[PDB]
Amino acid sequence: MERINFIFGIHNHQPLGNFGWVFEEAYNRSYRPFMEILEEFPEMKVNVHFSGPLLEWIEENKPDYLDLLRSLIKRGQLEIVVAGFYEPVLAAIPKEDRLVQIEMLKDYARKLGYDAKGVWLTERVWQPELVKSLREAGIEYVVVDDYHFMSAGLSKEELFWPYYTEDGGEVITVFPIDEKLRYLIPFRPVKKTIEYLESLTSDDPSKVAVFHDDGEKFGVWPGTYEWVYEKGWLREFFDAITSNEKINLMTYSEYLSKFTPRGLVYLPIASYFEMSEWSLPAKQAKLFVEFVEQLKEEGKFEKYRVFVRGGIWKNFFFKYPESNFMHKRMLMVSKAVRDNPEARKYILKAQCNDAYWHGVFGGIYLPHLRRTVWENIIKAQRYLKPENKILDVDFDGRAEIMVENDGFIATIKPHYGGSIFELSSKRKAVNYNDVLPRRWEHYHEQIPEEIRRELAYDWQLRAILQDHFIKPEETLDNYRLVKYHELGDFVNQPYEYEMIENGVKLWREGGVYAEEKIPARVEKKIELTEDGFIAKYRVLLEKPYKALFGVEINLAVHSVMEKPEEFEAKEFEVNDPYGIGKVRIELDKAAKVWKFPIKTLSQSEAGWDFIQQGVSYTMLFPIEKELEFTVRFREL
Numbered sequence: 153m154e155r156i157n158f159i160f161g162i163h164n165h166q167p168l169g170n171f172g173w174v175f176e177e178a179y180n181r182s183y184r185p186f187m188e189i190l191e192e193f194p195e196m197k198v199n200v201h202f203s204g205p206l207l208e209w210i211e212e213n214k215p216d217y218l219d220l221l222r223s224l225i226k227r228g229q230l231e232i233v234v235a236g237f238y239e240p241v242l243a244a245i246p247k248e249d250r251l252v253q254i255e256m257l258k259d260y261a262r263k264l265g266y267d268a269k270g271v272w273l274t275e276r277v278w279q280p281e282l283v284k285s286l287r288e289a290g291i292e293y294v295v296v297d298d299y300h301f302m303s304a305g306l307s308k309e310e311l312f313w314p315y316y317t318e319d320g321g322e323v324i325t326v327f328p329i330d331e332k333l334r335y336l337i338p339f340r341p342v343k344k345t346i347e348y349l350e351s352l353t354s355d356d357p358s359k360v361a362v363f364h365d366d367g368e369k370f371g372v373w374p375g376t377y378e379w380v381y382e383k384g385w386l387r388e389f390f391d392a393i394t395s396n397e398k399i400n401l402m403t404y405s406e407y408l409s410k411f412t413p414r415g416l417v418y419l420p421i422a423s424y425f426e427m428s429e430w431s432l433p434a435k436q437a438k439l440f441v442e443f444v445e446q447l448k449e450e451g452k453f454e455k456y457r458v459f460v461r462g463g464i465w466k467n468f469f470f471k472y473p474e475s476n477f478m479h480k481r482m483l484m485v486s487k488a489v490r491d492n493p494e495a496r497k498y499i500l501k502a503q504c505n506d507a508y509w510h511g512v513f514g515g516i517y518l519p520h521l522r523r524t525v526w527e528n529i530i531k532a533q534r535y536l537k538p539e540n541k542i543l544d545v546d547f548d549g550r551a552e553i554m555v556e557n558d559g560f561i562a563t564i565k566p567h568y569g570g571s572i573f574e575l576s577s578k579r580k581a582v583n584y585n586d587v588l589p590r591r592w593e594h595y596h597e598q599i600p601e602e603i604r605r606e607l608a609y610d611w612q613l614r615a616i617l618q619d620h621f622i623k624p625e626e627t628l629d630n631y632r633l634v635k636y637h638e639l640g641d642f643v644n645q646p647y648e649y650e651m652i653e654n655g656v657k658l659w660r661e662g663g664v665y666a667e668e669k670i671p672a673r674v675e676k677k678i679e680l681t682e683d684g685f686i687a688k689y690r691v692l693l694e695k696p697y698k699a700l701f702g703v704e705i706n707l708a709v710h711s712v713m714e715k716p717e718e719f720e721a722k723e724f725e726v727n728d729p730y731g732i733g734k735v736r737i738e739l740d741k742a743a744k745v746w747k748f749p750i751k752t753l754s755q756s757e758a759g760w761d762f763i764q765q766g767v768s769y770t771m772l773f774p775i776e777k778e779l780e781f782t783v784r785f786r787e788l
């Protein structure tokens with residue numbers, strides 16, 4: 153009967169902030185061999201997308217590769233597919249930024265000798281209004297998953313054709329990635345794809361099956377290089393796929409030049425299926441996984457998958473407050489910097505998606521990806537005149553206080569212990585509080601014993617200047633892990649405040665609960681200094697009681713494999729060369745200092761990830777009725 157049309161595509165992306173060797177390995181393990189083997193089969197057509205940073209790393213290091221890509225473009229073997237230059241999730245960035253981001257990559261594709269008409273949707277996060285944006289960028293089609301169509305209401309059998317979708321009276325074509333093909337290519341034996349595709353043929357000559365996935369699958373992921381190249385899966389596939397008379401190879405643009413989309417369809421906010429799991433808060437994700445697994449155990453997943461639903465990507469901002477804070481801070485700067493091309497480039501770089509969420513790849517859990525985002529938010533903001541302001545930054549209904557001078561930007565949350573949640577250095581372009589609290593992930597609970605004994609989950613968010621109250625006999629380990637007895641209620645409770653020149657005055661009428669409620673009061677005077685900040689404390693208990701007042705300061709120390717340690721100190725220094733650099737904490741009175749790394753257990757593509765997201769430093773001072781001291785943070 154009719155031949156089945158087949159579209160083959162890959163997506164190559166490397167996030168800003170990745171280690172140098174990671175790009176190098178991805179190139180020698182996948183980007184290069186894949187294209188070298190592609191050149192051996194003149195009839196093979198591939199639809200490829202390269203993220204901007206990747207193309208820049210390649211220009212600087214592997215120039216010859218680009219001539220190879222130009223050559224393959226010229227012989228009709230490659231269609232260049234674009235997206236936002238720095239791989240941002242389009243739906244999560246200002247519409248104005250979407251245009252500039254896409255146009256930057258279209259300019260690059262143009263330099264390779266191709267007029268890009270298609271967009272690879274980053275993390276396939278779809279929102280109806282993206283039609284307007286893509287259309288203004290001159291994009292005629294976007295790639296999405298078959299799952300998006302199933303969520304709209306269509307069955308898999310009507311997903312072997314692209315469709316139109318509209319919004320604002322504007323339309324754009326949409327191609328669905330066949331989930332089956334993602335399963336088959338390239339990990340299942342070659343003949344399995346040939347068999348699956350041959351079975352799709354019909355009397356409709358426009359029918360088409362689409363495969364589009366991570367290029368990293370062809371060499372980078374563990375065990376794939378041996379499978380794809382050493383054992384020859386790719387050469388065997390290119391040979392079979394270009395010989396089969398029932399399978400017609402073509403690029404997206406080629407398909408559209410010969411067949412018109414099947415019809416009109418509307419899509420919901422969705423992503424590829426796997427994202428439904430991760431984008432859910434921990435507790436629900438576990439349930440979701442249970443449901444999905446219990447559907448396969450009862451062999452009824454296939455006929456009922458079209459009705460399974462989970463979370464949406466944007467809710468990572470709910471799951472991870474730190475990501476939300478980071479995101480809203482960048483939206484804030486993007487707007488204020490929109491008219492300054494130089495400053496704006498930094499904010500566009502900050503929109504690289506990877507550090508804002510967590511699925512299987514570390515993402516937000518990788519400190520180096522996170523500091524890169526902050527680094528860029530800070531550099532973009534440094535162009536603005538410093539100004540103090542009170543406003544709800546992360547939209548939780550409780551205004552933040554932003555104090556700033558020529559060298560720093562501090563964000564205080566009165567509602568949460570009157571602590572500093574952001575201490576950004578304009579000189580180092582780092583956020584000293586670029587840390588993450590320890591949380592349970594639905595995939596926890598197999599974890600080895602060594603890591604198990606070090607696992608602990610926080611109940612407190614982690615910031616700078618968090619006021620504690622503990623028993624004199626309390627131990628570090630108890631505190632290190634989350635066992636210790638917290639006597640005060642000032643860590644996660646609101647404080648009143650008063651604005652003062654160069655700072656803020658906060659105080660809280662709380663209490664010290666032990667055997668009875670001993671009402672207490674905490675007063676803290678925080679002022680910005682040219683090299684950090686100074687905080688003057690005054691703790692007062694209504695009635696005598698022997699305890700230890702503690703001021704905790706969390707820091708994004710990342711290159712200092714620190715370990716539990718306690719010592720007496722009036723002043724101490726921290727040296728984190730690859731992280732926050734050098735800083736010094738000065739007290740006007742010796743204190744007991746407890747120090748411990750904030751350890752997180754994370755899921756990755758290559759085993760567990762037990763990462764130090766920072767180090768907690770908490771100065772203890774004995775108190776019975778009255779207490780007074782000063783803590784000064786100094787940037788060196």
Ligand SMILES: [Ca+2]
Nearest residue numbers: 544545548550
């Ligand atoms: Ca708020």
